[PDB]
Amino acid sequence: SVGFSTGGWTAGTYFSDNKVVTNQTRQFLTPIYNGHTYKALQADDLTNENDKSKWNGITTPWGYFNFNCYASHFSPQDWQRMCNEYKRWRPKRLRVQIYNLQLKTIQSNGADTQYNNDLTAAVHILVDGSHQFPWAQHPWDDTCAPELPYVIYKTPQYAYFQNLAGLANNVGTNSANKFLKMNTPLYVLETMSHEVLRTGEDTSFEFEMSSGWVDNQTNFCPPQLDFNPLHDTRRVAPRATNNTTQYAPYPKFKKPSNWVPGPGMAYPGRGEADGKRPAPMTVTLRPNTFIDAGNNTTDRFQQASYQEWKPTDDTIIGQSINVGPINCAATDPDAVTTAADAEDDVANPNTDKVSSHRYSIDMTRWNAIQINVRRNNGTPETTQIYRHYLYPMQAWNSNQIDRYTPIWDKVPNTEWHTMLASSDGTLPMTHPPGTIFIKCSKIPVPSENNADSYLNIYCTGQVSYEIEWECERYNTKNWRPELRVDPKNWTDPNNYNLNTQGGYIVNEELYETMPTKIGINRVN
Amino acid sequence: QSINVGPINCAATDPDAVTTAADAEDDVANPNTDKVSSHRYSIDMTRWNAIQ
Incomplete structure (x- = not known):
């Protein structure tokens, strides 16, 4: 009833050979969002020249839970033990419980604000498990459940994309412009069946997860260098003299390999001081039936070559398609393109404060690739491949991740996709755990004029979430001891600890990495 | 050797009209530009104009 609890606090991590189970409970707060209504959100009005986008979408009264991050499921201790004791792991399933719900009215009496509970108020809880709504979740969003278990979790508001103002507009006849505008979908969560719960009710959800592995081990040997120098190779290298070829054997310590360095792009970005x-x-999008108005009413394109339309810089900035990290097996951009978790004062350099995946010592990831030719006049020349695509006989490893990395990403729903090897370290999965949407019930109050007037309320409760992790211990024939995740290298010995104000101390002087793939060697 | 390969465009949308065309007779007397069939009409957002 009203005086019975619908659950209890569940916490702690279980370790075993083949599986690890994490248990977290958070007290959460859900307010009223967006005035209980749906609104269009147009970035052209919200932005300015420093960062401009044509992004259009819908903001909703709903909010959602986000469990996607490792620091959400692992304490620094438990993350250390994962990295030290297991060669790889992946999430098998997620169980979520929402319970001990409280609905309070916010009512002002004089200057005071009084909080009384409405015992008959309800909460809307929607789970979209088949992903029929947009999936607005960017993996690096700051909306994830809090790391410390005693911190309140404010659920983020849900909003999604509709169209690009530059592409979708009223221009031309039988044009991609109108069709993008006509065909723009609208999603309202009240059109799907969902639960409504009062204080005595609770609910639960389970999600099976299929994905690739997070690999904790590193390759000490480049696959090209794994050979025995004591012996000759039968294979001979060409030597060009005049119009003929003379052959000589490769040196014992240089043996040509069948194995091509993995795909990579070393592009840092423009490095400009703006957000453009x-x-x-x-990436720029121009449907082939698109009509350019020659105004600001549409995106702008100049034809550079026959049947080629080059976007203007404003068009590139406007459509605001940003892709990174793209580096894959190239290691030069690692530090610059993977960075996260930094606030910019500009007063003090955050260069070493920022987190990035730069710390991998793996030997399958390349600085530079050189191709070698000889011209007719006898001049050898070598150039480098800055964008190197998928090619037969490539083998490589993923970059390292840390505890502040998001666990999963959603694979786009499309006809075709290539192998899922992420540069940011997420595990792409076709169906991630379904999003749990939460909304306070809309309690209307009578009004003399016609007006939308409701009762100001909010929801508080406890969310318990659990992931079962499939893991594997490592065996090695290595004689020597290996690197492990440990505090010894920290600049600041007092880290992941509390100060006298209650502040949780993380990475103040420098970013202290607790990365995967630090020490465990696998043989080629 | 007369080896001709097309359409190769795949996810690039600029060649769609020009490289996919079919079902046209050439009199040259009247333009067949709009008479010809091609797959140019997709509004899909996964296919790109340009990559920078």
């Missing part, structure tokens, strides 16, 4: 085109890769 910050990513290494930007």
Whole structure:
């Protein structure tokens, strides 16, 4: 009833050979969002020249839970133990419980604000498990459940994309412009069946997860260098004299390999001080039936070549498609393109404060690739491949991740996709755990004039979430001891600890990395 | 050797009209530009104009 709890606090991590189970409970707060209504959100009004986008979408009264991050499921201790004791792991399933719900009215009496509970108020809880709504979740959003278990979790508001103002507009006849505008979808969560719960009710959800592995081990040997120098190779290298070729054997310590360095792009980005085109890769969209108005009413394109339309810089900035990290097996951009978790004062350099995946010592990831030719006049020349695509006989490893990395990303729903090897370290999965949407019930109050007037309320409760992790211990024949995740290298010995104000101390002087793939060697 | 390969455009949308065309007779007397069939009409957002 009203005086019975619908659950209890569940916490702690279980370790075993084949599986690890994490248990977290958070007290959460859900307010009223967006005035209980749906609104269009147009970035052209919200932005300015420093960062401009034509992004259009819908903001909703709903909010959602986000469990996607490792620091959400692992304490620094438990993350250390994962990295030290297991060669790889992946999430098998997620169980979420929402319970001990409280609905309070916010009512002002004089200057005081009084908080009384409405025992008959309800909460809307929607789970979209088949992903029929947009999936607005960017993996690096700051909306994830809090790291410390005693911190309140404010649920983020849900909003999604509709169209690009430059592409979708009223221009031309039988044009991609109107069709993008006509065909723009609208999603309202009240059109799907969902639960409504009062204080005595609770609910639960389970999600099966299929994905690739997070690999904790590193390759000490470049696959090209794994050979025995004591012996000759039968294979001979060409030597060009005049119009003929003379052959000589490769040296014992240089043996040609069948194995090609993995795909990679070393592009840092423009490095500009604005927010216009910050990513290494930007993309522009021009449907072939698109009509350019020659105004600001549409995107702008000049034809550079026959049947080629080059976007203007404003068009590139406007469509705001930013792609990164794209580096894959190239290691030069690692520090610059993977960075996160930094606030910019500009007063003090955050260069070493920022987190990035730069710390991998793996030997399958390349600085530079050189191709070698000889011209007719006898001049050898070598150039480098800065964008190197998928090619037969490539083998490589993912970059390292840390505890502040998001766990998963959603694979786009499309006909075709290539192998899912992420540069940011997420595990792409076709169906991630379904989003749990939460909304306070809309309690209307009578009004003399016609007006939308409701009762100001909010929801508080406890969310318990649990992931079962499939893991594997390592065996090695290595004689020597290996690197492990440890505090010894920290600049600041007092880290992941509390100060006298209650502040949680993380990475104040420098970013202290607790990365995967630090020490465990696998043989080629 | 007369080896001709097309359409190769795949996800690039600029060649769509020009490289996919078919079902046209050439009199040259009247323009067949709009008479010809091609797959140019997709509004899909996964296919790109340009990559920078």
